[PDB]
Scaffold this active site. Structure first.
Site, PDB file in Angstrom:
ATOM      1  CD  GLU A   1      -2.765  -0.618  -0.178  1.00 46.49           C
ATOM      2  OE1 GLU A   1      -3.243   0.655  -0.023  1.00 46.49           O
ATOM      3  OE2 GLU A   1      -4.194  -1.582  -0.369  1.00 46.49           O
TER       4      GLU A   1
ATOM      5  CG  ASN B   1      -8.238   6.721  -4.442  1.00 45.29           C
ATOM      6  OD1 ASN B   1      -8.170   5.648  -4.622  1.00 45.29           O
ATOM      7  ND2 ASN B   1      -8.568   7.351  -3.156  1.00 45.29           N
TER       8      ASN B   1
ATOM      9  CG  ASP C   1     -13.844   8.442  -5.129  1.00 44.76           C
ATOM     10  OD1 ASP C   1     -12.615   8.797  -5.112  1.00 44.76           O
ATOM     11  OD2 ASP C   1     -14.548   7.621  -4.515  1.00 44.76           O
TER      12      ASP C   1
ATOM     13  CB  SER D   1     -11.814   9.396  -1.522  1.00 47.29           C
ATOM     14  OG  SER D   1     -11.135   8.898  -2.619  1.00 47.29           O
TER      15      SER D   1
ATOM     16  CG  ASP E   1      -6.590   5.736  -0.951  1.00 49.13           C
ATOM     17  OD1 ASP E   1      -7.834   5.986  -0.366  1.00 49.13           O
ATOM     18  OD2 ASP E   1      -6.475   5.010  -1.794  1.00 49.13           O
TER      19      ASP E   1
ATOM     20  CG  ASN F   1     -10.965   5.825   0.944  1.00 48.54           C
ATOM     21  OD1 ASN F   1     -12.624   6.737   0.550  1.00 48.54           O
ATOM     22  ND2 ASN F   1     -10.142   6.620  -0.640  1.00 48.54           N
TER      23      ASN F   1
ATOM     24  CG  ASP G   1     -15.737  -2.894   7.027  1.00 46.65           C
ATOM     25  OD1 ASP G   1     -15.740  -4.205   7.229  1.00 46.65           O
ATOM     26  OD2 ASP G   1     -16.321  -1.801   6.788  1.00 46.65           O
TER      27      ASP G   1
END
Ligand SMILES: [Cl-]
Ligand SMILES: [Cl-]
Ligand code: NA
Length: 129
Positions: free
Chosen positions: A35, A46, A48, A50, A52, A59, A101
């Site tokens: 990562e 990213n 969209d 957003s 990271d 994110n 989650d």
């Protein structure tokens, strides 16, 4: 901070990640390698809009607030800049919420594509733990 492999393994173990929700320590080290290349200051934008952040590339659409991702959630209740500290505590505490989650470590694309189903214990081999 750019961590060493065993240095990061030891810090992650100290913070309770070894076997957390069934994921051995090698899974966490492998995910941090692909990562962020073990760099706490890593950021990536990213499509969209957003971004990271940090050693596990958490994110801004869901987990932290960076003031520029409209409509986003802040489920870890932290500013995204806290994920870039040389102290990994905030990243670790937020990652524990993500992996709990429902989808486990499949939340990390690089873990799914480059660690899952490999010999991940190789990532902690040789380390004094
Ligand atoms: Cl392991
Ligand atoms: Cl799982
Ligand atoms: Na956010």
């Amino acid at each position: 901070k750019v961590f060493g492999r065993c240095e990061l393994a030891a810090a992650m173990k100290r913070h309770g990640l070894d076997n957390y929700r069934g994921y051995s320590l090698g899974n966490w080290v492998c995910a941090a390698k692909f990562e962020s290349n073990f760099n706490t200051q890593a950021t990536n934008r990213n499509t969209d809009g957003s971004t990271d952040y940090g050693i596990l590339q958490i994110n801004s659409r869901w987990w932290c607030n960076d003031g520029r991702t409209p409509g986003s959630r802040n489920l870890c209740n932290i500013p995204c800049s806290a994920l870039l500290s040389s102290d990994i505590t905030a990243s670790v505490n937020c990652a524990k919420k993500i992996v709990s989650d429902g989808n486990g470590m499949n939340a990390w694309v690089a873990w799914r594509n480059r660690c899952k189903g490999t010999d991940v214990q190789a990532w902690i081999r040789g380390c004094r733990l």
